[PDB]
Amino acid sequence: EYRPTLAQLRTFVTIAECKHFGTAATKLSISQPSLSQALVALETGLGVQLIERSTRKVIVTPAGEKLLPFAKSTLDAAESFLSHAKGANGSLTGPLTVGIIPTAAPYILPSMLSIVDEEYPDLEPHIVEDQTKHLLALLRDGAIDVAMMALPSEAPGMKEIPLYDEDFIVVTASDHPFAGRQDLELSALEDLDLLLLDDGHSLHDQIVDLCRRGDINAVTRASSLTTVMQLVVAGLGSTLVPISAIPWECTRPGLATANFNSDVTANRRIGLVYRSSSSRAEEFEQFALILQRAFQEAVALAASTGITLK
Amino acid sequence: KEYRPTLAQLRTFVTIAECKHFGTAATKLSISQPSLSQALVALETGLGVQLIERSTRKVIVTPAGEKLLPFAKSTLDAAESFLSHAKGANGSLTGPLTVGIIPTAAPYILPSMLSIVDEEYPDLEPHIVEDQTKHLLALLRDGAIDVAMMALPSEAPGMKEIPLYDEDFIVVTASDHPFAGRQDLELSALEDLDLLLLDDGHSLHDQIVDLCRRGDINPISSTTAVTRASSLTTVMQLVVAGLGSTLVPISAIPWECTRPGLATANFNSDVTANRRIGLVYRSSSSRAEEFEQFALILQRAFQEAVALAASTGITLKQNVAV
Amino acid sequence: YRPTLAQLRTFVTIAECKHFGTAQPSLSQALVALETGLGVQLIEIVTPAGEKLLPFAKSTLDAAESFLSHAKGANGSLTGPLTVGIIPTAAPYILPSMLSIVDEEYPDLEPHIVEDQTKHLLALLRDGAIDVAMMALPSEAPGMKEIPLYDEDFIVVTASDHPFAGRQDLELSALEDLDLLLLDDGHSLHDQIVDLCRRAVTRASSLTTVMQLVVAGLGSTLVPISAIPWECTRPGLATANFNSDVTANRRIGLVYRSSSSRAEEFEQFALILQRAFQEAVALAASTGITLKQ
Amino acid sequence: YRPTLAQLRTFVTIAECKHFGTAATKLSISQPSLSQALVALETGLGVQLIERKVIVTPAGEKLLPFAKSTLDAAESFLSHAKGASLTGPLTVGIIPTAAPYILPSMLSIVDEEYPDLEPHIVEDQTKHLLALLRDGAIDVAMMALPSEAPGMKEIPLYDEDFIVVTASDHPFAGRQDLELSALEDLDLLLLDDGHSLHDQIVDLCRRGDINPISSTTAVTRASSLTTVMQLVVAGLGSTLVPISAIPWECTRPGLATANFNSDVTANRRIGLVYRSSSSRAEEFEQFALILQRAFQEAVALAASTGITLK
């Protein structure tokens, strides 16, 4: 029958932090007997000793230490409810768990995390980097609030927010014939021996469908771009990478870049995907503007390398 | 003086928004209809906003109520998780518990497992997640599930394993197959068979490839084959048609090995072809004794599944003398 | 330098006559030409270097001998291998009657079955890994051609104690009352005035697992009629159908590449699948469970 | 009648190249010679394989895969004949936390000293590597020991130390005397690195006491070192990385390194894992020497940065 109350949890957390009884009661604006009564009601209702009262100062019991984080997250959730009830109207505050695909996370995070720390200090971002299938799994579950991935995400129960279109660039060895060329056609993909990420990466299908666009159609297989780059330096083939990856993957010795001609469009559409049942549309659209800004900062960093962009 | 909402008020507001009536939300919370209406009006007055729009046909959530509903549900989930870990630390099975089960064990362990928790653990609220081993461990690190039932060893770091039971394998061939009915097979006999295996993400796929390599066999012709199924019931239809044989765990016998056109066969007692199923949870978890108690339910549910397999009359593998 | 089949066939033949069999001036010349072209001593007894190369040479002949074997039945309709991909919600219910028809009427055909989701079949179909795919229409994929096979109705599966158990007059509004556990495969639900069109923590990956949840009273589900004899006859279940004005079904078809020149061969295989479905429907009707009218 | 390889290459090239004057140019033969080998193959088999544009006949489509597998088998024979220790193809699997840091030196050694060797790299997680090793999809795997598989045999390669990477402003930045107790103060973001922390003096306090995580959503978690690094610069925690990753991940601005004291041993044991049934033990032992050499070059590159190592 017993369920703990917020006032009891609010008492237990304040006592564990302030470590005294006459200082936790003053911060909560309640009497010292009222503080001790909510604690004993919480202890009796759960049947576990939470606070050990000594003569010098009170100490949190071993069992209390394990429960304290769960009690604080309960209060943060309740305080988050009162903040939005007071007319928040779509402001980045409180926790926000964001899932990002691995081919975009390390290239968008530096500018995105810097913008949040300086302009949205109340926001508490949590970053989850995994492949597209696990992100949608965590999105259908409650483990993440929003996911950054390539559109379309073929998911029915989700809604998409288009962010930007990110061009591709060809990465070859320095001695490769196509090195430095800026006028390639899609037919040139036939001459290349492309090195692709495995089947769970969305970049793997963004390139095999790009070859099928009016051209022709295995054992070598990597899971990260940095590993593919080392294979390209050694001359075991070429690859396509998004422009935001240039300063982090395309500046090591032994590499060279190449672009298609202006009439060719080889890119990927990155967007923000969230649950249809969510009522936080205007909160996600505001977070979408941060990501759009972080991408333009990432593009500027790519141009700063001196490598010719599309 | 300054207003703070309570859990009982939030619990009322969430239930009303989901059930949409005032006589089905009160019954679900096991409270009276006036008590429900007072907590809602107290929550509405304390915040000074209209959360629910009352009509005669049905109740609708107001625009302001829609924005607040997710925050109220996350508040209840956080409080319900606090009570779960407070009672879980001593071994109590209360509140929600999301369990993950591999697909080659879920439909054969659930009937007895769900019947035990419904009759002996009414406060427990089980949620079932059936997916492959890789996705279960992924969902376990990210907190999407609380515990996972899978084959040991899991080799995943930061996790702890609770060994449950050892489940023997049985060979399923066509009725006309030469090995049909034999109870003395050696591991060398796998060479003669044309095994039909599940794809690469199923743990049963590797529990059989290493089984042939134990008998000096090269399973190259069977693993890199073209024919490939994702479920045991599909593999069974191929065995009936005489396109090869397969190995299945004993708990799958009453559900997959009783259709016409099949026949069973076991290895000899000196051969040990089985799998070790265990309970896997996070090392940071403080509900160890709660999971240890849930392990006893699964062990009992397995013995009922084995008893159901023995009830078919099909000879099971004998690992020892009688 | 490139080796020839005649040279490889000689080197394999010595080891393949080293058992209980016996395999000529020409023979020694083809072997010496193979050894000189590669610059390695292969035969002394087989040399150490020859033992490592022998399996790769034997697999070369097995591939060449398989080409001559399939070069035979080439001028036939359903002959040789045929790799077909089937969605998991249709494979185990169409296979029994489909393999029985090809075993009795097309003995030269060598079928290979690939069961996976719709996306992976289309992926394997573009990359040539499978020759044809059985899935729900429309596939929306370009460069592919579709052969409509049949329209397969759905049936509602609830617990025995459920109120809707046995009802044969349900409307789409009844889906609101149910707590559905779905596989998404095949969904296309829409009445004459509904306006629905469909594309929880508990989640299963197979129908047999969903069924065990329905017996335990953790919700209801919709299954195709061909799954009735294999999934809906265990104790604790009950069936229900929509009324005739409601149309809850899926359109299954055969999809192959447009560049393929085997259209007339696939069209003949489409008739086998159509027959196998009518046999599967007859098996469902043999259970006594009422089907949708 | 038996078909020849030259006849099969003609039939395969014609089926792929859409003209008969583009297949002949690729084979460096004449247009009449191409048509004669095709007609000889058609007459020898007595079936029509090819039908002012060429289409492959229904019978030709069924035979085309068998002709390509015949050529792949013949090309496989020439690859292994090339020098038959270390000749022909060799598919090696490497864990993602070691591949991009061992490949540059390893691929350079095999190119200069083992030209007949044909390496194919497979980068994936340890569990998927062992799966591909049982099913014969790869010949050898580089991973962390001990391997819990019984049907495999292990060749120990080297022990690779870890280094602590924090933000530049972090208090522990630059310290070379850390104890295991210091891990409590850090908010570690860990990859499945293979590491095993262990002090030569077991501190009694930390033995057992763990901190339970608590959140309704998922906690911050990355899948690659390059993503973890971007989180460390932004001050969302610290991490442990292997020394070979220093020149590729620990030289960006905003990072700082730190090592434990000599009594602490934080490393991982990397080895070569192959099947017990394999008869190329003496060859895998030779390939093990290449990895050992490639690791010492990777360590030398790490020492070349000037960052203090363990």
Q: What is the CATH number of the domain that holds A58?
A: 1.10.10.10
How far is Cα B28 from Cα C104, in angstroms, rounded to an integer? 59
CATH code (residue B235)? 3.40.190.10
Instruction: Determine which helix (DSSP H) or strand (DSSP E) holds A274, and give its type and residue range.
Output: strand A267-275
List of residues 6+ apart from D213 with CB closer than 8 A: A69, B143, B282, B284, D219
Closest-CA distance, A199 to chain B, in angstroms, reads: 13
Instruction: Determine which helix (DSSP H) or strand (DSSP E) holds B55, and give its type and residue range.
Output: none
Domain that holds residue A39: 6-86
Among candidates C99, C115, C211 on the partner chain, residue whose Cβ is nearest the Cβ of B241? C99
- Contact between A237 and A192 under an 8 Å Cβ cutoff? The reply is yes
How far is Cα C274 from Cα C279, in angstroms, rounded to an integer? 9
D291: left (phi over 0), alpha (psi -120 to 50) or beta: alpha
Furthest-apart CA pair in chain C: how many Å? 88
**Residue among C1, C2, C78, C257 with most chain D CBs within 10 A, to mutate:** C2
As a whole number of Å, the CA-based R_g of chain D is 27
Joined tokens for residue A101: 């695909």
Angstrom distances, CA of residue D111 to CA of D99, D108, D305: 17, 5, 26
How far is Cα B310 from Cα B316, in angstroms, rounded to an integer? 7
Angstrom distances, CA of residue C46 to CA of A86, B175, C35, C53: 87, 44, 13, 10
DSSP annotation of C283: H
Q: What is residue D18's three-state secondary structure?
A: coil
Joined tokens for residue D85: 């220790």
Residue C33 Cα to chain centre, angstroms: 46
> Is C208 in Cβ contact with B233 (below 8 Å)?
yes
Residues of C with CB under 8 A from a CB of B: 81, 83, 88, 91-92, 95-96, 99-100, 103, 112-116, 201-206, 208-209, 211-213, 215-216, 218, 230
Residue D273 Cα to chain centre, angstroms: 13
Among candidates C3, C9, C70 on the partner chain, residue whose Cβ is nearest the Cβ of D62? C70
The string of DSSP letters for D81-147 reads HTT----EEEEEEE-TTTHHHHHHHHHHHHHHH-TTEEEEEEE--HHHHHHHHHTTS-SEEEEESPP
Instruction: Quickly tell me which residue has 């933000």 as its tokens.
Output: D167
Residues of D with CB under 8 A from a CB of A: 16, 91, 96, 99-100, 103-104, 107-108, 111, 120-125, 212-224, 226-227, 229-231, 233-234, 236, 248
Distance separating the N- and C-terminal Cα atoms of chain A: 66
How far is Cα D214 from Cα A161, in angstroms, rounded to an integer? 30
Residues of B with CB under 8 A from a CB of A: 4-7, 10, 47, 49, 66-72, 74-75, 77-79, 81-83, 85-87, 89-90, 135, 138-139, 142-144, 286
List of residues 6+ apart from D158 with CB closer than 8 A: D269, D270, D291, D292, D295
Instruction: Quickly tell me which residue has 């299938």 as its tokens.
Output: A133
How far is Cα A65 from Cα A59, in angstroms, rounded to an integer? 10
Select from C77, C79, C116, C84 the least CA-distant residue to C98. C84
Other chains touching B, judged by 3 or more CB pairs under 8 Å: A, C, D
Same domain, D164 and D77: no
How far is Cα C146 from Cα D39, in angstroms, rounded to an integer? 34
Closest-CA distance, D216 to chain C, in angstroms, reads: 14
Write out chain B residues lying below 8 Å of A95, CB-based: none
Among candidates D8, D60, D78 on the partner chain, residue whose Cβ is nearest the Cβ of C3? D78
How far is Cα C275 from Cα C100, in angstroms, rounded to an integer? 11
Q: Which residues pair with D156 in a beta bridge?
A: D271
Torsion, Cα C204 C205 C211 C217, to 10 degrees, reads 10
Instruction: Quickly tell me which residue has 């829609």 as its tokens.
Output: B66
Joined tokens for residue A43: 């202890």
Among candidates B74, B82, B144 on the partner chain, residue whose Cβ is nearest the Cβ of A143? B144
Joined tokens for residue A9: 């949890």
Residue D23 Cα to chain centre, angstroms: 35
Select from B265, B236, B267 the least CA-distant residue to B252. B236
Instruction: Determine which helix (DSSP H) or strand (DSSP E) holds A293, and give its type and residue range.
Output: helix A281-303
Instruction: Quickly tell me which residue has 């949840």 as its tokens.
Output: C213
Joined tokens for residue C198: 């469909």
**Residue among C1, C68, C266 with most chain D CBs within 10 A, to mutate:** C68
What is the structure's resolution, reported in angstroms to one decimal? 2.6
Instruction: Quickly tell me which residue has 């089937």 as its tokens.
Output: C86
Select from D309, D291, D299, D300 the least CA-distant residue to D93. D291
How far is Cα D126 from Cα D199, in angstroms, rounded to an integer? 26
Joined tokens for residue A288: 């979408």
Q: What backbone phi and psi angles, to 5 degrees, belong to D265?
A: -125, 100
Name the closest residue on chain C to residue D71, using Cα atoms.
Answer: C60
> Is B70 in Cβ contact with A280 (below 8 Å)?
yes
> Is B75 in Cβ contact with A81 (below 8 Å)?
yes
Number of H helices, E strands in chain A: 10, 9
List of residues 6+ apart from C132 with CB closer than 8 A: C82, C83, C84, C85, C125, C254, C255, C256, C266, C269
> Is C56 in Cβ contact with D80 (below 8 Å)?
yes
**Residue among D215, D217, D228 with most chain A CBs within 10 A, to mutate:** D217
Other chains touching A, judged by 3 or more CB pairs under 8 Å: B, C, D
How far is Cα A172 from Cα A257, in angstroms, rounded to an integer? 6
How far is Cα D194 from Cα B97, in angstroms, rounded to an integer? 30
Could you give the angle at which helices B288-310 and B106-120 cross, rounded to 10 degrees? 120
Residue B76 Cα to chain centre, angstroms: 25
Q: What is residue B261's three-state secondary structure?
A: coil
Q: What technique solved it?
A: X-ray
**Residue among C212, C231, C279 with most chain B CBs within 10 A, to mutate:** C212
Name the closest residue on chain C to residue A139, using Cα atoms.
Answer: C201
Instruction: Determine which helix (DSSP H) or strand (DSSP E) holds C154, and give its type and residue range.
Output: strand C144-159
Joined tokens for residue C235: 């104790």
How far is Cα D192 from Cα D257, in angstroms, rounded to an integer? 20
Q: Which residues pair with C238 in a beta bridge?
A: C158
Instruction: Determine which helix (DSSP H) or strand (DSSP E) holds B161, and give its type and residue range.
Output: strand B159-174
Q: What backbone phi and psi angles, to 5 degrees, belong to C42?
A: -100, -35
Instruction: Quickly tell me which residue has 């890994």 as its tokens.
Output: C129
How far is Cα A241 from Cα A256, in angstroms, rounded to an integer? 12
Write out chain B residues lying below 8 Å of A71, CB-based: 82
Strand C247-257 to C189-190 pairing: antiparallel
Q: What backbone phi and psi angles, to 5 degrees, belong to C265?
A: -75, -40
